[PDB]
């Protein structure tokens, strides 16, 4: 079989040399039907040769050889013979013995063909595949789920799912059945996890990946499923707080609903903001979850598609209490949160708001931060808050600044920093101690 792959590579290298020469019977290109059969043999051998439990290396070589065979110069718009994939992908249905590696290689080849082919050719070629792609979405193998997720992501990026809860699953018949199966499996998975008396979030895994693929180029898609998805998200957060992929599924779900606040009902919106995100901030032990929540809140703040000032205030106050307390060692997370607080205090819209009054402990944490870049940004904000005058700053430190929020910090450091800022900076350095100077 390796020898056969070698012959295919020989034909490809002959066409590379033809391209080099062209950049007359010896210079004329190869007959197209031979290119077609070489491409099709490469596809078939790549999908077949993987072992059920080595041929994996020959598969990878065939895949690379196919990726070189289909280029803007080598053999674009070759024919393809995809019908045989229908039999292969249906094997996923059979749980006795199935070559999962073959399924993964075929799905990868399909996603590559989606980058290779022209759009009408994509639509024409993929129609029989729809049953096979739909079959993959059911199996419990995580590798196949990820492969089909990537394939569907690329396909739906080329052709986005229908909005508005339109009755047709797609405007394209070649996508209609596949997209109907995608929607049905999403709905059934969410409903099953809602119904389940006791189940791991891992049951959601494939459902969540497929849903993410369906929403990749159509954020509105989850508006169909918003109630059932929100109840599943509540169940996920509850299972996470009171117990490794759980974090990944919670982050994925949060990324899905982060921009659909206007669709959710008032009770669901309130639960999401003051129940889910707040309990993640307060209870959740995973710092990656905290980083994701802080990123979501930062995107909200920096932007009815965004939360009200009260919800932003609630989230920022919860973060200001919990993030420093629960994760003192995480310098990156605290840096991210203090960067957000710095943006808030720099923002002109929020200046003088109740929020800036509520975030004063966070600002004072920024002034006393052990990370010099944060401390400098906070002092730069602090410096401009008052006039460059000795008397006014002495009055500030005596009268205006409640220093209680500094805690055990020796806040005399901030007084020194504030008053020395008044000094002239551009004057050449010098002394009154002329008797001590080196002549």
């Amino acid at each position: 079989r390796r020898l056969a792959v070698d012959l295919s590579e020989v034909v490809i290298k002959w066409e590379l040399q033809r391209i080099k020469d062209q950049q007359s019977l010896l210079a004329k290109p190869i007959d197209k039907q031979h290119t077609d059969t070489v491409v099709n043999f490469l596809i078939r051998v790549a999908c077949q040769v993987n072992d059920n439990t080595p041929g994996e290396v020959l598969s990878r070589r065939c895949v690379n050889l196919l990726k070189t065979a289909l280029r803007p110069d080598m053999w674009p718009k070759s024919e393809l013979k995809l019908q045989w994939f229908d039999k292969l992908l249906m094997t996923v249905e059979q749980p006795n013995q199935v070559n999962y590696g073959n399924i993964c290689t075929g799905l990868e080849v399909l996603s590559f063909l989606l980058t290779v082919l022209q759009s009408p050719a994509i639509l024409s070629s993929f129609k029989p595949l729809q049953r096979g792609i739909a079959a993959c979405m059911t199996c419990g193998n995580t590798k196949v789920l990820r492969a089909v997720h990537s394939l569907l992501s690329r396909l739906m990026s080329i052709f986005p799912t229908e909005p508005s809860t339109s009755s047709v699953a797609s405007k394209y018949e070649e996508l209609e059945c596949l997209y109907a199966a995608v929607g049905k499996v999403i709905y059934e998975g969410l409903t099953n996890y809602e119904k389940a008396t006791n189940a791991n979030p891992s049951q959601l895994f494939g459902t969540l990946m497929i849903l993410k693929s369906a929403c990749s180029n159509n954020p509105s898609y989850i508006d169909r499923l918003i109630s059932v998805f929100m109840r599943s998200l509540q169940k996920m957060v509850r299972e996470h707080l009171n117990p490794s992929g759980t974090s990944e599924l919670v982050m994925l779900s949060l990324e899905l609903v982060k921009t659909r606040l206007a669709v959710m009902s008032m009770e669901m919106r309130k639960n999401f903001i003051q129940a889910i995100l707040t309990s993640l901030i307060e209870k959740s032990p995973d710092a990656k979850i905290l980083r994701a929540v802080v990123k979501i809140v930062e995107e909200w703040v920096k932007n009815n598609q965004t939360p009200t000032l009260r919800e932003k205030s609630i989230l920022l106050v919860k973060m200001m209490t919990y993030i420093e307390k629960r994760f003192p060692e995480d310098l990156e997370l605290n840096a991210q949160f203090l960067d957000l607080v710095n943006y808030v205090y720099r923002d002109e819209t929020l200046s003088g708001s109740e929020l800036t009054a509520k975030l004063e402990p966070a600002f004072l944490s920024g002034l006393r931060c052990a990370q010099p870049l944060i401390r400098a940004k906070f002092f730069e904000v602090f410096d401009n808050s008052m006039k460059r005058r000795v008397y006014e700053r002495l009055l500030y430190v005596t009268c205006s600044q409640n220093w209680e929020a500094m805690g055990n910090h020796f806040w005399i450091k901030q007084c020194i920093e504030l008053l020395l800022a008044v000094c002239e900076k551009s004057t050449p350095i010098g002394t009154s101690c002329q008797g001590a100077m080196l002549p």
Binding site: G352, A357, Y396, C399
Partner: peptide, 11 residues
Amino acid sequence: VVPPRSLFDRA
């Protein structure tokens, strides 16, 4: 004597 305004005074 009027204290200077701070970033935390609710204007």
